[PDB]
Design a protein around this nucleic acid. Structure first.
Ligand code: ZN
Ligand code: ZN
Ligand code: ZN
Ligand code: ZN
Lengths: 1211, 659
RNA sequence: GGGGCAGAAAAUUGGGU
RNA sequence: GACUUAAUGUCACGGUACCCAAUUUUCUGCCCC
């Protein structure tokens, strides 16, 4: 009686090349995969897949023995013997496959010894007494025959299978010993196999059918046995890359590749209907990346053309292949432990009367944090890329939790719960009998995917170089991480006599109760908090496998229909109501609960936090050069992803901040190389030879709904040291979060602690946390500017008590005399040049950013900032801040800089003024210069004063201290809060009654400074402190009707005597460097700095005074220690109370910023011939006469430089 | 000239690494830097790379093969990968005409010796055909400079081992100022078949081996030569096997005060075949009783020496006084592994209390049939018998598998295992081998430790239990033999609530909910220490098998150091069964349970429990407060025929110690 | 008699098992 | 029927693609023939 039997796989089964019995031994892959499905070719492609009838027969006889054991060797009333699974090599030949597995056995209950006359059902299903033996197919003399199972539909291998590399991970460490490839096939499309089972003996049909219904898995997967535009898009990408090369923009073709790759997250409508940033209205170039003339057309339009011409593959596939293509072209031009694993018969006799049951654990594995199930790159996963790290997805692109990774994590947690397990060995001839293995051999669980096939967010990563506190050479990589909140179905079947308390402990550890919060660490990247799944919706069922096995066979164990079980009623599946609670399991609270200790805390950031996610800055509209990083959280309750993305500091950034803090505290950071090391940092944070003992999580922003505008648009610039204007290409705008001292940002992050930390290590981690709270390590980018400064930390009350216990623990007498200005009261030039000379000192032995050296100092400085003339710090975020554009279109009206409605000074401006002052003071090189400008302007700066290149040639004292490229500066300035004072300068006639319409602000012309090649180059440009705002205040109406409205700029002005408070968190500063920085901050009485717009007009004169200087090795230094710091600064300066005017360059410098009103000198720019306010009749002061070579010689540079206060009209 | 200059720098750094002065820890980092430099050279110079760079690459890959230790018992995969990479990278070099005689000879020598090393590691990759090709290359190159490079000496001895005449280089190898004694012995015995000179060099070789750690190249290759002699059916293999036994025993006699040994995958066969040699000497038609008795005594001594020590892979290896010796021993062994290639009171085996017969067990895998070296002081006669253990191992594995699922319900399998012990060891019930009414001490070998030898059943219809006639106490090895009452408890509520509550027999310094400190704080040595806790097993490192007491428990190692006040006390570890302390058996079981640590501290004997038993039986055993083998017979432990589960409980209790 | 810049240079992967 | 099984013995659900790395460094939203 021929029986047609149909396979069906409900999860990805495994595949191997068929090879042959005599040829399998030569290949390790096929010798490991004897139990897999077999692939035979028909070229080494387009073959046929099949499952051997011998493997199906082995599964069937295993099911037969299990059924008989469950019934004490008596199925349907007919007794069954023990069979025989021993072959005597003398009396025959050994079978092709040897068992080396425990065999379930029972009593005899047989009338007579089994012979070939009245054999029991077990013997005639084993083929014991048939006429066919171990010889091959010759004749059909089999009492029971299992034919080969071929796939039920060329059939190319890549179409059915997909190569995946598996793993074997340690337990003492988190590393893997080895790995092995596999050919997991496609269970959805090619998942049905058909074969024939022929059974001559009709006496044992029922047992055979029961065994067919009882086979629960095959080839690594659940089974239900049932009776009866490439090569053209690549060319276009090559054309695009060639046109980019024509513009000499091949350095950013890589960034375009990442933008294209991340365009998959955006819809196709982004390129269909223009949603990309369009640039400025009058830029005349547009976007620096999308408005590029490639083959005579803009990149946006041609990308729309490509999308219309590549609609076949779809937006996700088209953009992925496109990004890979341009990545390959960019790489082409620039140059771009597999361990595959005597004869004993062990009879296992279950006691008579025992009760065995099967428990199904149906739930959902919600991801509390973004997950990462790693997989090998494409072109290496082929059976037979652009992103550095790939995530695991199936053919439908949905996220997958593989059965292997879930099983491995479950085994690790089970070993933890037991506390005594084995390192799983490969190729052993005896079943491992340790506690965890016994239960793992009974646990079967289903591979499950999420119903969410959307592209994974790319999470970038870098490695900081401790020596320079910047990015490392070749340290950049990107990881594809799945969204947070995704719910994967969870299936777990345990077959046995009693449910172990350790598996219950694992479930409760994994479960997400009101306080458990879920602790199933799944997949890789656990050190950065990737893959902490909170298993939920838990339902436990059970089968009465002894007296209710007929319906278990009828329902096939609910294999492949677990979604129906989770939704809700089959016979013999009463729910398991005896599932022990969390606080009733000894193994749980003993080993699993204290395994990981959560340390949750809320960081309070009182400054604009900028994580600088630049790839999404290009694609997202607005044309922001750098925007803050935002997450992508999947809303499991309402499906889909939240339209509003959560801003957060990356868990990698959190981990790196803590790790760097610890390394600088101890000294492990800065070692030559971390070999197989047991240092404090290596033990706590893991290394290449172990795993991290601490796992960090994202610093999600919880206080985001209390902001009118969460992201504050801050413009930046770099000002040339010579011309005084902005550089050639230096204007850039960041998009940080809104962070103010009054209204700060709260970031609630957490990290988990293993139960192996000593007192010293816990003290180290608490010291790192305190340093984070103290503000030593600002979050995000531009930390040396005032971005992401931590104002404090508020630890949660749920933290363990022991951890919480450790956590809770000026005037300058110098006066500059001055000259000329008081000796007459006469008009001077608004700016002068400081020819300091080419004598430049470079320090080869740069100070590393490693552990704080004891000789040098570090800490913070609190400085008050007083204004002597009105200060202009426009908030260029709003081009219509004063609401005056409606009356006069084209007028650039500005508002004073403010975050969340409070008046602040960005730390960029303070750092710029201090860096310029210090560079002028120490004869540092021109750090920012307009090189190659019309020989070239930068070609006549002698040789030493050029901007500092890499650290090969050394760094200038200003460049050493404030930092350069590939060397982070040792001084961080902060945003200056208001802290009381006379707020506004009322005008009584202005449009908002608190502004001042400024004059025409024109770009500086270096031609006047250098009229001929005879003069080499003037020095640094500084603006005097003349009270020139008074003439602008008086001529408010005369300038609003004469100058062009589209060119005049108006903004609110701060009144005289306004104070500001800001911090200067200098670190690793030398004994004399700190004193010199103090002198730069507070040069003394009658000397003040210039800040903000209108410096040539006398606006924004600022006087800095120091309130308190701190230093830690918290120790507020006294005034005596404040002195003898500036003293050795002067001592260092001369060899390159102090009397600064002794050095001529410093004398001229301090003359430039000397305030001659602390009587009222008048300073203004000349005019063009008889222009407005010419005043020709007496003190002409007009161009084409003062600038004429005949009237005035080429000594204008002589009078315009090295003469800080020389008169112009009389001379 | 970049290739030549960087190759010269690589040669400099390789030569510095080859100097034995540098420690292996920095050697790995410097050779990794050398690998990085050489691969960076190879990146831009793949087009017919010069011979010097390829030779430097081959030397560097040989050295990366040597610096990586075998983490497990088997050959590490990294070493195989290094060998394969070296031969693959040198294939291109040897396929091209270098043009220099010296460079070609060096390339041939390194390729041939690399193939020899691969053959030693695994014959599958390189067979005897590879060795013949190596001989052809060496003959063509003529690299037989014995007095210049020992590399040539190694290739010469390996070639001579291939059964091919090497009389051409015989004169050069005769002097061989850079050779070692074993190479001279091999050359003398193989080519010239001169046994006198072979043994003359052999004695010096084993004398040198007496002072070298077990990780050296000499040990593995000398045991390989000895087994080659044994397979050659020679006559001089026995003497050198015994001499290597003696050298190994003396070398580790002082080193490893914590009862430790170094695994090299050839120690076991060395002891096995030395045992076979002395056994063949014993049964070599000896006319004198004294010499045969001395030979059997030496048999017992070598059986005991293997048992008296440990076997730990360095993966498991990798107060503070003990850790100092651990670190020093690990450093010395790891140094001696790579140095091969680069240029309280002892107890005599014969002094035993009167009326005590000892049964030393040895399981030799080479012969395949175990031995039982017995010794009784009634006649002061040593005799031994042989038995098969493979089927006994099958029955023991059956019982172990059935027990881990149905602990109490596996009594029938225990009865079967005991009957198998009786059948496979019929001399236990023999009057001549073991007289009746004589106290017996067992020294079981690897998997015989788990066997309930005291519960053996004679091959009879009503087979009498072995426990009824003799009083049995066990011992891991012979090297372990040398007031108030104290109780410690860390069990769960609901069990053993009577001894803690009703304690009228003692328990003054008792501690319910005891921690490791409570065990360590016992100052005075009591007359009976009782420990109540179920310990966990360490499947990899028996040094870290622990007793699950409070505050993290106390391990095997912590007992050896912290606990001092326990000398001469009959400890009863009748709470954790003996088999949850160590791992489970696979072919052999050389792991030592916690009771062995207590014995080494100085405890007078541990009344353990082989398998898990209900709390009532061990509670009754504790309440038995008179000074085992008599209680078991009276309590019903001889009713295996009628009450299997009753037999399962009583037999489990054995006293691990020597009164 | 007129707005000038609106990003620039780096790092986009290296080591292990 | 083959393309593929061997039948008195297939723990391969017998193995987490795992571990290390801070999208950061530098820059006044500024200014005249
Ligand atoms: Zn039968
Ligand atoms: Zn195990
Ligand atoms: Zn370290
Ligand atoms: Zn410089």
């Amino acid at each position: 009686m021929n029986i047609t039997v149909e396979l069906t796989f409900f999860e990805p089964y495994r595949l191997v090349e068929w090879f042959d019995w005599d040829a399998r031994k030569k290949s390790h892959s096929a010798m490991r995969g004897q139990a897999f499905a077999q692939w035979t070719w028909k070229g080494r492609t387009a073959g046929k897949s099949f499952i051997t009838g011998t493997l199906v027969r082995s599964a069937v006889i295993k099911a037969v023995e299990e059924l008989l054991s469950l019934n004490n060797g008596k199925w349907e009333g007919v007794p069954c013997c023990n069979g025989s699974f021993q072959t005597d090599e003398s009396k025959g030949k050994k079978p092709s496959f040897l068992r080396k597995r425990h065999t379930l056995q029972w009593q005899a209950n047989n009338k007579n010894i089994c012979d070939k006359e009245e054999a029991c059902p077990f013997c005639i299903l084993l083929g014991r007494f048939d006429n066919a033996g171990k010889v091959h197919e010759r004749n059909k003399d089999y009492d029971i025959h299992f034919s080969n199972f071929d796939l039920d539909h060329d059939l190319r291998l890549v179409d059915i299978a997909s190569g995946r590399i598996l793993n074997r991970v340690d337990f003492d460490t988190g590393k893997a010993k080895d790995y092995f490839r596999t050919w997991e096939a496609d269970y959805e499309t090619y998942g049905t196999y058909t074969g024939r089972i022929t059974l001559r003996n009709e006496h044992a049909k029922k047992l055979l059918l029961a065994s067919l219904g009882f086979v629960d898995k095959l080839c690594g997967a659940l089974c239900r046995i049932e009776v009866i535009h490439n090569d053209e898009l690549r060319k276009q990408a090559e054309v695009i890359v060639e046109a980019f090369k024509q513009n000499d923009k091949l350095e950013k073709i890589r960034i375009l590749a990442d933008a294209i790759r991340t365009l998959r997250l955006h819809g196709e409508g982004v390129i269909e209907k223009d949603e990309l940033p369009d640039g400025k209205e009058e830029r005349d170039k547009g976007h620096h990346l999308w408005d590029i003339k490639v083959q005579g057309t803009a990149l946006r339009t041609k990308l729309k053309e490509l999308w219309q011409s590549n609609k076949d593959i779809g937006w996700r596939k088209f953009t992925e292949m496109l990004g890979s293509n341009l990545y390959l072209i960019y790489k082409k031009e620039t140059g771009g432990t597999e361990y595959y694993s005597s004869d004993l018969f062990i009879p296992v006799t279950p006691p008579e009367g025992i009760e065995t049951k099967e428990w199904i654990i149906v739930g959902r594995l919600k991801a509390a944090t973004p997950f990462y199930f790693g997989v090998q790159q494409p072109s290496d996963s082929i059976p037979g890329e652009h992103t550095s790290f790939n995530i695991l997805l199936d053919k439908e692109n949905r996220y997958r939790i593989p059965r292997s990774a879930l099983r491995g994590a479950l085994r690790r947690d089970l070993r933890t719960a037991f506390g005594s397990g084995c390192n799983v060995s490969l190729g052993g001839q005896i079943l491992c009998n340790c506690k965890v293995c016994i239960e793992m051999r009974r646990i079967t669980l289903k591979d499950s995917v999420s119903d969410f096939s959307e592209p994974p967010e790319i999470r970038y990563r870098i490695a900081k170089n401790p020596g320079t506190a910047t990015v490392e050479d070749g340290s950049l990589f990107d990881i594809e991480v799945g969204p947070e909140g995704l719910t994967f179905p969870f299936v777990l079947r345990y077959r046995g006599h009693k449910f172990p308390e350790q598996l219950s402990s694992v479930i409760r550890y994994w479960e997400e109760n009101d306080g458990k919060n879920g602790m199933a660490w799944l997949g890789g990247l656990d050190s950065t908090g990737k893959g902490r799944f909170a298993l939920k919706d838990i339902k436990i069922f059970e089968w009465d496998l002894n007296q209710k096995i007929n319906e278990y066979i009828k329902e096939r164990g609910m294999r492949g229909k677990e979604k129906e079980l989770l939704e809700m009623l089959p016979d013999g599946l009463i729910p398991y109501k005896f599932f022990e609670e969390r606080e009733c399991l000894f193994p749980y609270k003993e080993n699993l609960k204290p395994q990981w200790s959560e340390v949750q805390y809320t960081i309070e950031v009182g400054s604009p936090l900028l994580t600088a996610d630049t790839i999404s800055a290009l694609t997202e509209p607005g044309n922001r050069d750098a925007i803050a990083y935002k997450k992508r959280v999947y809303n499991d309750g309402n499906n889909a992803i939240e339209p509003e993305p959560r801003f957060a500091v990356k868990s990698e950034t959190h981990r790196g901040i803590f790790r760097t803090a610890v390394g600088r505290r101890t000294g492990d950071l800065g070692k030559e190389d971390h070999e197989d090391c047991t240092c404090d940092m290596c033990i706590i944070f893991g290394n290449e030879h172990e795993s991290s003992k601490i796992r960090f999580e994202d610093l999600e922003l919880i206080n985001g709904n209390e902001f009118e505008k969460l992201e504050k648009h801050i413009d930046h610039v770099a000002i040339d040291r010579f011309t005084g204007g902005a550089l050639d290409k230096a204007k850039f705008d960041t998009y940080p979060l809104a962070g103010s001292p009054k209204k700060p940002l709260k970031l609630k992050g957490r990290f988990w602690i293993k139960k192996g930390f000593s007192g010293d290590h816990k003290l180290l981690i608490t010291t790192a946390l305190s340093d984070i709270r103290d503000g030593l390590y600002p979050l995000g980018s531009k930390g040396g500017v005032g971005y992401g400064w931590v104002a404090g930390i508020s630890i949660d009350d749920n933290v363990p008590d022991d951890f919480k216990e450790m956590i809770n623990k000026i005037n300058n007498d110098y006066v500059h005399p001055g000259h000329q200005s008081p000796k007459q009261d006469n008009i001077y030039y608004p700016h002068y040049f400081l020819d300091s000379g080419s004598k430049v000192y470079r320090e080869k032995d740069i100070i590393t950013h490693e552990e704080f050296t004891e000789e040098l100092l570090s800490g913070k400085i609190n400085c008050k900032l007083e204004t002597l003339t009105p200060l202009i710090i426009p908030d260029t975020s709003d081009e219509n801040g004063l609401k005056l554009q409606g009356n006069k279109p084209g007028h650039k009206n500005y508002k004073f800089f403010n975050i969340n409605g409070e008046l602040m000074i960005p730390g960029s401006e303070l750092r710029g003024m201090l860096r310029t002052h210090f560079e002028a003071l120490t004869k540092s090189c021109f750090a920012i210069f307009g090189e190659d400008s019309t020989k070239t302007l930068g070609g006549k700066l002698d040789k030493a004063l050029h901007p500092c290149t890499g650290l090969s040639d050394g760094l200038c004292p200003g460049c050493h201290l404030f930092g350069t490229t590939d060397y982070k500066g040792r001084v961080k300035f902060g945003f200056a809060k208001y802290e009381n004072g006379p707020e506004w300068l009322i005008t009584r006639g202005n449009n908002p009654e608190r502004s001042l319409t400024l004059g025409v602000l024109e770009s500086p012309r270096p031609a006047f400074s250098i009229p001929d090649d005879e003069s080499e180059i003037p020095g640094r440009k500084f603006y005097l402190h003349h009270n020139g705002w008074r003439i602008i205040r008086q001529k408010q109406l005369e300038i609003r009707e004469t100058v062009q409205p589209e060119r005049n700029v108006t903004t609110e002005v701060m009144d005289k005597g306004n104070v500001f408070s800001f911090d200067v968190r200098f670190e690793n500063l030398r004994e004399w460097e700190l004193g010199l920085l103090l002198q730069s901050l507070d040069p003394g009485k009658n000397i003040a700095h210039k800040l903000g717009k209108g410096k040539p007009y006398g606006f924004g004169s600022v006087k800095i005074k120091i309130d308190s200087l701190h230093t830690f090795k918290i120790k507020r230094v006294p005034q005596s220690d404040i002195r003898e710091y500036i003293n050795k600064g002067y001592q260092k300066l001369i060899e390159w109370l102090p009397q600064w005017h002794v050095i001529p360059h410093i004398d001229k410098l301090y003359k430039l910023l000397w305030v001659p009103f602390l009587l009222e000198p008048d300073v203004r720019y000349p005019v063009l011939n008889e222009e407005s306010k010419g005043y020709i009749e007496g003190s002409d002061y007009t161009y084409k006469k003062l600038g004429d070579k005949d009237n005035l010689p080429y000594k204008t540079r002589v009078k315009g430089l090295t003469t800080p206060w020389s008169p112009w009209n009389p001379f | 000239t970049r290739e030549d200059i960087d190759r010269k720098e690589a040669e400099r750094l390789l030569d510095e690494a080859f100097n034995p002065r540098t420690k292996p820890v920095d050697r790995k980092k410097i050779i990794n830097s050398a690998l990085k430099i050489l691969i960076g050279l190879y990146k831009e110079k793949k087009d017919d790379l010069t011979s010097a760079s390829f030779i430097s690459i081959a030397r560097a890959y040989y050295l990366v093969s040597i610096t990586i230790l075998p983490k497990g018992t088997t050959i590490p995969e990294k070493k195989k990968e290094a060998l394969r990479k070296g031969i693959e990278f040198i294939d291109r070099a040897i396929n091209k005409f270098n043009g220099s005689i010296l460079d070609s000879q060096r390339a041939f020598r390194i390729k041939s010796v690399l193939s020899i090393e691969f053959n030693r590691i695994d014959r599958e990759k390189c067979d005897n055909i590879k060795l013949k090709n190596l001989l052809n290359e060496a003959v063509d190159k003529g690299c037989t400079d014995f007095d210049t490079y020992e590399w040539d000496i190694q290739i010469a001895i390996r070639l001579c081992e291939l059964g091919v005449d090497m009389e051409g280089h015989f004169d050069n190898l005769i002097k061989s100022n850079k050779a070692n004694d074993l190479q001279k012995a091999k050359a003398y015995y193989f080519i010239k078949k001169d046994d006198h000179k072979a043994k003359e060099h052999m004695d010096k070789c084993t004398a040198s081996l007496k002072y070298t750690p077990c990780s050296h190249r000499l040990w593995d290759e000398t045991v390989g030569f000895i087994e080659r002699l044994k397979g050659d059916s020679s006559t001089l293999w026995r003497d050198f096997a015994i001499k290597t036994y003696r050298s190994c025993r003396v070398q580790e006699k002082e080193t490893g005060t914590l009862r430790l040994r170094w695994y090299w995958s050839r120690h076991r066969v060395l002891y096995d075949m030395a045992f076979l040699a002395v056994k063949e000497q014993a049964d070599d038609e000896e006319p004198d009783v004294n010499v045969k008795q001395a030979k059997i005594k030496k048999l017992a001594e070598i059986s005991d020496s293997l048992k008296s020590r440990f076997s730990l892979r360095l993966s498991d290896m990798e107060d503070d006084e003990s850790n100092h010796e651990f670190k020093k021993f690990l450093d010395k062994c790891v140094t001696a592994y790579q140095d091969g290639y680069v240029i309280a009171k002892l107890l005599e085996l014969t002094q035993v209390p009167e009326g005590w017969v000892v049964v030393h067990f040895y399981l030799n895998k080479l012969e395949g049939m175990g031995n039982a070296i017995v010794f009784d002081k009634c006649a002061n006669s040593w005799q031994y018998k042989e038995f098969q253990y493979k089927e006994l191992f099958e029955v023991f594995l059956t019982w172990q598998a059935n027990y881990n699922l149905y602990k109490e319900n596996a009594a029938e399998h225990l009865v079967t295992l005991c009957k198998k012990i009786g059948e496979t060891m019929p001399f236990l019930f023999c009057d001549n081998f073991i007289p009746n009414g004589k106290d017996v001490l067992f020294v079981p070998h690897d998997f015989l430790h788990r066997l309930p030898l005291h519960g053996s059943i004679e091959n009879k219809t009503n087979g009498k239990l072995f426990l009824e006639n003799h009083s049995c106490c066990y011992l891991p090895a012979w090297s372990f033999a040398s007031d108030e009452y104290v109780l410690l408890k860390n069990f769960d509520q609901g069990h053993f609530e009577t001894l803690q509550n009703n304690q009228i027999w003692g328990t003054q310094s008792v501690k319910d909910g005891a921690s490791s400190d409570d065990l360590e704080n016992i100052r005075n040595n009591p007359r009976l220490l009782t420990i109540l806790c179920h310990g966990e097993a360490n499947m990899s490192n028996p040094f870290r098998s622990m007793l699950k007491l409070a505050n993290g428990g106390i391990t095997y190692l912590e007992i050896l150091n912290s606990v001092k006040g326990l000398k001469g006390s009959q400890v009863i570890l009748g709470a954790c069964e003996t088999d949850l302390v160590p791992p489970l058996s696979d072919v052999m079981d050389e792991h030592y349970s916690v009771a062995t640590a207590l014995l080494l501290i100085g405890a007078a004997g541990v009344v353990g429990t082989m398998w898990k038993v209900r709390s009532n039986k061990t509670k009754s055993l504790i309440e038995w407060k008179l000074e085992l083998n008599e209680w078991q017979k009276e309590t019903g432990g001889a009713a295996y025929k009628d009450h299997p589960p009753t037999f399962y409980r009583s037999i489990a209790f054995r006293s691990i110690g020597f009164p």
